[model samples]
Target: IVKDFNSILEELTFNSRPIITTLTKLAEENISCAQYFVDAIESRIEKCMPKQKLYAFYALDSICKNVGSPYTIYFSRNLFNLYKRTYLLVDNTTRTKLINMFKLWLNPNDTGLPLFEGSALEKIEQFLIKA
Candidate 1:
């Protein structure tokens, strides 16, 4: 057990492109590692400080866009808590990014599949729209 998701994810960088190595590694069986990556990504929130969350959050964007499927449904299920932790970063980039994600997800065409179910996602969109 040298390493798996963690090592692959640990190897991720904000200094990367969409072709991130980690993104590629998981692409094969993104289904197998699906929530494995999601749950692990959450630990990264703790791994990163404040601004470093960009690395973690950005990784999610890349991962979600790069590999959609169970990844989308599973991740969306936890977006509320995942996003809440990111909110602790307290800045414009993340706030705007939150809206950016919500907007992109709102349009199914963006990722082919519907971002989230029902209008529940509006809470994040509208909540961020205000304070």
Candidate 2:
């Protein structure tokens, strides 16, 4: 799966000229913005990955960050908190998966967005204490 994603990114970057032309044409066509693509991906994720839901949430979170949607910040916080709580409760392998989720959340190659909600992290810590 990781290799597949890398391949996709490689293809997208390799065909940058065509991609730019397409984007320019999108603007010229004046039909809609690129954000509709992001929304469609988010909806697809919501339908497909409800079990590994955090991955989808984080994926959409990163997309929204790049797209500069304020609502993404709020949803990201909520998903992060839920990921911490439910993910931390699992056993070793699942815990590792959860940690990977955190790493992805903080990864440079991923969104790498600065968290604006300090209180949200504190709340997750507090919830952990109660558990």
Top model number, lDDT: 1
Model 2 error, position 100 (Å):
3.4
RMSD of each: 3.0, 9.3
- Runs with alpha carbons beyond 4 Å of true place in candidate 1: 18-21, 108-113, 118-120
What does the lDDT come to for candidate 2? 0.44
**Per-candidate TM-score against the hidden true structure:** 0.74, 0.39
lDDT of 1 by residue, 54-93 (tens): 6676666666676766666766776766676677565887
lDDT by candidate, in order shown: 0.64, 0.44
lDDT of 2 by residue, 6-77 (tens): 233223322244433433333234324444443433443444433444444444444444444443444444
lDDT of 1: 0.64
Weakest lDDT window of 10 consecutive positions for candidate 1: 19-28
